[PDB]
C-alpha cells in the first residue's frame, strides 16, 4: 500500500498510510507536487498535536472502512466512534485550542467540527462571568451597555 511521511515543525517524522492522510484536504493538496515523496512539511503543527490528529484520522478511516465491510449487526462502532470521540476530547484547554488550530490548518472538517462543538458544549450552562473566568476574557461592557443587551435579549423566548 502507498505510505507517506509527514514532517512536524520540530523535525519529527510520522510514517502513515496514504489514504488516512487523504483526510486532510491541505495534505491532499500538497500531494500534487513532488513533496508527496520528498516528505510533506508541516511548519505550523507540533509533534503531539500531529500525533493526535493522525490518531483521530486513523480511527475514522479504519472504522469507516470497517463499516465499508461487515454483514449484519456489526456497525456498533458508530457509537464507539462517538464514545471514543467523547473520551478523546477529554484533553486540557491548551491542547484543545492547538487541536482546533491544526484542524483549521489541515482542513479536516470532521475534527474541526468536533472540537468546535466541544468548545460550544463547554460554553453551555454558564453565566457571562463564568464564561469570562473559564476562557480568561476581560469584560469591556459598561453597565448601561449590559442593560441594553439584556433588554434586547428579553425579546427572545428561552
Amino acid at each position: 500500500a502507498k505510505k507517506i511521511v509527514l514532517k512536524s515543525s520540530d523535525g519529527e517524522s510520522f510514517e502513515v498510510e496514504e489514504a488516512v492522510a487523504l483526510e486532510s484536504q491541505t495534505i491532499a493538496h500538497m500531494v500534487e507536487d513532488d513533496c508527496v515523496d520528498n516528505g510533506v512539511p508541516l511548519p505550523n503543527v507540533t509533534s503531539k498535536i500531529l500525533a493526535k490528529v493522525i490518531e483521530y484520522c486513523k480511527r475514522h478511516v479504519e472504522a469507516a472502512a470497517s463499516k465499508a465491510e461487515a454483514v449484519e449487526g456489526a456497525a456498533t462502532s458508530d457509537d464507539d466512534l462517538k464514545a471514543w470521540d467523547a473520551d478523546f476530547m477529554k484533553i486540557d484547554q491548551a491542547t484543545l485550542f492547538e487541536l482546533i488550530l491544526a484542524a483549521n490548518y489541515l482542513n479536516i472538517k470532521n475534527l474541526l467540527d468536533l472540537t468546535c462543538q466541544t468548545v460550544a458544549d463547554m460554553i453551555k450552562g454558564k453565566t457571562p462571568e463564568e464564561i469570562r473566568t473559564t476562557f480568561n476574557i476581560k469584560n469591556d461592557f459598561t453597565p448601561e451597555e449590559e442593560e441594553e443587551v439584556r433588554r434586547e435579549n428579553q425579546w427572545a423566548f428561552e
Binding site: 485550542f97 492547538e98 468546535c116 460554553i123 453551555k124 469570562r132 480568561n136 435579549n153
Partner: protein
Amino acid sequence: TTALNDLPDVILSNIMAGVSDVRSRNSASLVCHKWYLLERATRSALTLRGNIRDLFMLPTCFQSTSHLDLSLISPWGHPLTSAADPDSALIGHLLRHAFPSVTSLAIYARDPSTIHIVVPQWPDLERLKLVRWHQRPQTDAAGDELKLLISECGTLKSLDLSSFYCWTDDVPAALGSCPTFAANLKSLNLLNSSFSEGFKSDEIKAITKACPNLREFRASCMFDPRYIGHAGDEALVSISVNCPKLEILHLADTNALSSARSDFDPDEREGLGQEEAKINAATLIEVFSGLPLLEELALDLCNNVRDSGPALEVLNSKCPKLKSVKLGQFHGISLPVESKLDGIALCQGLESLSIRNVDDLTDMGLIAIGRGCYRLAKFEVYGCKKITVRGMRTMASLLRKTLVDVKIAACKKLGAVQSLKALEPIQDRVERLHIDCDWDCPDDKTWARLRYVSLWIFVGQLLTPLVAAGLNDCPELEEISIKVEGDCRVLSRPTVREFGLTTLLNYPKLSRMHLDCGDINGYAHTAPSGQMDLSLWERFYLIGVGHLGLTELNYWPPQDRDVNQRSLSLPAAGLLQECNRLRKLFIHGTAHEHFMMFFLRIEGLRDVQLRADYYPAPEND
C-alpha cells in the same frame, strides 16, 4: 498559551454556531463586544417574546436570524395586525426592518389581514407555518384567505398547516387556484388533529394532483368507510402516482391524531372501528412500488387492514431508503412459520418502528421483528393483547446494541412492572422510555442513560408505586411527562389525599415536567355527593409540586366538556405559586388575571404564558 479569543474569527463563528440553547446564547452575548457581535451575527432562530403593544421597541440587532416565530407573542392568539387599526401596516414594515434575512416564518393567523400584511414583507420566504386555534372566519368561498396567502407568497417551498384550523375544502381550492404555487411546493403539512373530518378521497386527489414536486406529504384523512367520500384505495393510488418523489408520507385518521386514547383505541370506542378500511394488500403493494424514494412511512388508521404482511414485504425491496415505519391497526404484521421471516421483519433498514393495535402479534412475531429489524433504535408498541414479557424481553435482548427509545402502552399482559422487567437487557442503555402506570397486572439496576420518561395513568390512580415498579435508580433522569386521562364524573372520591408527585423526589436530576391533565372529564363546580369537582382533582394532582426542584413546567388543567372550560383554579394556582425554582411555566388553558399576577411573585420566573393551543380556543380574550 493560546486563549480562546486569539482564535480566528471563522473558528469563533463556528464555535458560536454550536450554541443552540437560547439561554446560553443570551449569556454569551454578554461576555464582551466581540462575543456580542459573534452571537448576533450567528443567531439563526428567534421566537419573539413580548407584547404586541410594545412592537415599536423591537430590537434591530437580530439581522442574521433566518427563522422567525411570531406565534407566541403576547397576548397569546391575539391578532398581530388588524386592518381596522390605522397604523397596522407600519407594524409589518417594522418587522422587515428588524429581521431582513427571514426565510422561515411561523405566525398566528387569527385575522386574514395579519397574513396579508406580514407575509409579503419577505419575498424570499421559503417556509411558512400558520397557527390558528380559534374559529375560522366566515368567508364567501372556501380557501379565500389561503388564496390571498398564495397570492402574496409565490416562492414558498414549504407550507405547514398542522396547527392551522380551517375547513378541509379550503386547501384544495387554494392549491388549484394557482398552479405555479402548488408546483413549487416541496413539503405540505396538513396533519391537523382539529379537523372535524379528515380530507376526503377527492380532496386528497386534487391536492396531490396540484402538487407534483412534493417531498413531504402529511395529511389527516377520513379512512372510515361509514361516511361518504372516505379516503380509500384510489386515494392511495393517486398519492403514489401524482407524487412519485415523496420522501415522507404521513397519512393518519383524524381520530388517530387525538390526544385522548378514548378517541382512537378500538377497545375504548363503543363498537366503533372494528371494521375493515377500504385498503387492500395488493393496492398497498402498488403504492409502495410507486414510491422508490420513500424514507419515512406512517399509515395510522382507525380501521383495520388485515393480512398486510405481503404488502410490507414489498417495502424492503421497493423502498431501499425506508428507515422509519409507523403503522396503525395494520394486522398480519409478523406471522412467522418455522423460522422464516416475513412482513415487517423483512425490512432490515428500519431504524424506527411504531406498532399499534395488532391482534395477530404474538411473542414469536415480536421476536421475529427483533431478529429481522436488527437496526432498530426506536420501538413503539400500542395495544397488543397477546404479547408477553417473555417476547418483549427477548426482543430487547436481541436489540440491546441499538435500542434506546422504547414505548409500551395499552398492552393487557404488559403492565408497569412487566414493562420495566422486559426492558432489563437495555436497562443501562435505554435513553427514552414510556410505560403505562398499570399497577394491578397479575404476575445492576441503574438506569444509567435514561434521560426522559413518559407516563400514562388513569384518573384517580396513585403515582407512589412507580419506584416499587422498577424505576428506582435513574441518575440522569431530567424530564418526566405524565399524562392523565379518564372520566372522573363516575369515579368516587379517592381515599388518599395526594396523587403522589413527591415520589418524583426519588430522582435527583429531574428538572422539567409535563403534567397533562387535559383529558380528565369531570364536574366544574357541582359534583354530586361522594364526588369531587375539578378544583379538588387539581389539588389532588398538584399537591407536592412545590417540593420538586422543577425549572420548567407545562401544565394542562382538566376540562369540563359540558361547560367547555379548561380553567386554572384558585387551589391549583396557589399550589403552583409554591414553585420558587420555576424558570418557565406554560399553562394550556384559561386562568383568571389575578392567577397570572400571582406567578410574577416568583423571582426567577422568566417565561410565563397562557396558551390555549386546543380547538376551539376561547374567544373571550
